[model samples]
Target: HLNFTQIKTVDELNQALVEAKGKPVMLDLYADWCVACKEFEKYTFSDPQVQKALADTVLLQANVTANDAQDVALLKHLNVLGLPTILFFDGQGQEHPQARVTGFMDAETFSAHLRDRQPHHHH
Candidate 1:
């Protein structure tokens, strides 16, 4: 139920924000060449419960495996120091001040993170 769209450019990402109209955006930065990224795709995101919990948010898959210029630029803009960085953005295409999650966590933990960061569901 966790709907995700693949994003190739920052423009498209911004456009997604516009479409979201103030919904939270989750960016999953991954590289096909990374084993951890593969594991996350296989294990973390595939969870049924976690997927359903995050269904209301906008999810974007950012593939950095090809060394595409746009991806590189986005990474730099977001100051991504590592792989599998999860960025949280507000509906206005601006990052949430307290909404960034980096590295990996289990499905339950990831879902909890999302819930905690939601506008009305703060812990």
Candidate 2:
């Protein structure tokens, strides 16, 4: 399971990823303007299943719409064209190694995705 820290800048994100060093990283991309994102955090993250999924892995939340100057460059580099995007990364912080699950996902479904795609199965 992965517990995430909120990331405001690309450097922080990259640093966290590197620190993890092949550990799984879950990036919860959100925007202040996104109601669903807010709802997901308020309701979804509280779910037992979701909580279980975030055990040891590094979890991060990035607010893209808040005009957080720290995130602007990283957001652009990520080429986020939408409001809410969930990205999973390996310890290396390689975007390619991780998968981006977009939109609001319920806890059960989100848990299944985690189980189905265990980071242990990857390098």
Candidate 3:
């Protein structure tokens, strides 16, 4: 449903955010053992309408499966508290705290959220 750019470190994510200027970016923190992450992947993310809504959004995925030093460091850098957390960044590479998602969200709710966070030209 989504093509995600695999990011390992905070530096990689920072670079990706900068490279994705003028577009909304979605960063998904996924761990292989996380049940909610699996639900998100198999259900919410697999929705065609949800996929269509996010077609223009830059997708990034951080695999925290191993919970290695880099993964731990990256998670700490972002102040992420749990698995399956989704962070939303605006065109300017600024995170929207209110738009941060956790756990498994239904496609209907997620699609509406995408509508609320749509990118538009301001300057």
Superpose all Cα atoms of candidate 2 onto the true structure and report the RMSD in Å to 1 decimal. 3.0
For all candidates in order, the CA lDDT equals 0.77, 0.72, 0.90
What TM-score does each of the candidates earn? 0.84, 0.80, 0.94
Kindly provide the TM-score of model 2 when superposed on the true structure, using C-alpha atoms: 0.80
Clashing pairs in 2: 1-55, 1-56, 2-54, 2-55, 2-57, 3-59, 4-59, 5-59, 22-91
lDDT winner among the candidates? 3
Residue range 26-100, candidate 3, lDDT tens digits: 999999999999999898999999999888789999999999999999999999999879999988889988888
Candidate scoring better on TM-score of 1 and 2: 1
Candidate 2 lDDT tens digits, 5-122: 7778888877777777767777887777798887777767878778876675678888677666666787787777676777776556666434577777778877887776545535
Report clash pairs, candidate 1: none
The reply for model 3, stretches above 4 Å from the true place, is: 118-123
Q: How many residue pairs clash in each candidate at the backbone level? A: 0, 9, 0
lDDT of 1 by residue, 14-72 (tens): 77778876566788888978777777777888898778877777788888898789989
Best-matching candidate per TM-score? 3
